[PDB]
């Protein structure tokens, strides 16, 4: 039985980046080069593996993380990057093993669409694969905020405001990050040429 990649890549709704979704892929056959030879992707960068060689490999598990960000932010979904997205929303480790895949979703995630949010305020950077869903008012000074917005007291999330009129750098992009797990355990996710 084939791994449910279509459930991730062709999902009708995608999550906001601060609340990125994770699907655990396990006990199935994965056809990576079907994805690889597709022409629908503006980004297909892999780290620690070769995209052509993926169908001959096995992993303990595969994780598929998915979310929507801005086109000029796709460069932050890579090891060693900084910025509002990598720092406070979704962080890849330095020794990342996997593939980052993205495509313009202007014709899907732009209506003025204010549904998609990102985290703007956070006192420390996320650890790799950390997910912070808190909505507590951000305390920018020494005075407690007590749950109300005001001076030095900011709501931590802000909306992308996707308008289909804008250039491609400011257009919404759906992203899928595939991470390949290799442990001293049974390998349940294998390519067809294994």
């Amino acid at each position, epitope marked *: 039985n084939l791994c449910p990649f279509g459930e991730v890549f062709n999902a009708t709704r995608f999550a906001s980046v601060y609340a990125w979704n994770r699907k655990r892929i396990s006990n199935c056959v994965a056809d990576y080069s079907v994805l690889y030879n597709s022409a629908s992707f503006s980004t297909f960068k892999c780290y620690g593996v070769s995209p052509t060689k993926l169908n001959d490999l096995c992993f303990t598990n595969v994780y598929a993380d998915s979310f929507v960000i801005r086109g000029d932010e796709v460069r932050q979904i890579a090891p060693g990057q900084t910025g509002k997205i990598a720092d406070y929303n979704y962080k890849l480790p330095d020794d990342f093993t996997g593939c980052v895949i993205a495509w313009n979703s202007n014709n899907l995630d732009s209506k003025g669409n204010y549904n998609y949010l990102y985290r703007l305020f*956070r006192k420390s950077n996320l650890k790799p694969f950390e997910r912070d869903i808190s909505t507590e008012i951000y305390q920018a000074g020494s005075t407690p905020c007590n749950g109300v917005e005001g001076f030095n007291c900011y709501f931590p999330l802000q909306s992308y405001g996707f308008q289909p009129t804008n250039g491609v750098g400011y257009q919404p992009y759906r992203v899928v990050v595939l991470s390949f797990e290799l442990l001293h355990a049974p390998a349940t996710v294998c390519g067809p040429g294994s």
Partner: antibody
Amino acid sequence: EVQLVESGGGLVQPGGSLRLSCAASGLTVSSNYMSWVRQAPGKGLEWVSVFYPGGSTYNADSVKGRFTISRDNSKNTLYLQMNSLRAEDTAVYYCARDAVYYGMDVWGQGTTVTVSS
Amino acid sequence: DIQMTQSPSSLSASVGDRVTITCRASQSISSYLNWYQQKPGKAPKLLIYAASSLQSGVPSRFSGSGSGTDFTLTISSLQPEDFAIYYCQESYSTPGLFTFGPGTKVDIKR
């Protein structure tokens, strides 16, 4: 109350170095997007450097490789180290807190840097 | 990057006038635009944030308007202390070294 107080401006030769400070009261530097913004004589405002709350820092291309923004949490103070200064770096330098959606609501009074031979 | 332009470069008005200043953005940046006033030799002062919200401490004669690509700042009854330069500012670009408009100077009509 709430204030930013810049110091360290002065006259320096081209190729020289200068360190500006910005002492904060009424907001936490390490918790904010803190900026240095300068204004040359008769010109408009130019962003110089920004310090993210979590630690990332960024420089405008105009000062790349020469200016370094930093901060000291114990003193609640923001700094700008300016090296390899040039005549066109002459300006009044402001420190400011950027609440990006809520605007740059707190500004210092500014400190003047003059670079000349 | 995003380039930002304001109209007009300069405006003449009298005390008690109703003044409107406009600002144009290289892209549609939704409601992410702020308005500032600057007097000669002083730091800019925040007047409007999020295109329409009045900064606390700023007199009610100041109001902001607009969305998307074009925004207008309005002074309902110009006071003597309002003669100054007015800047608009986008809060949208990456990584936070934002761009200011070129400024509209309001001087005294005679």
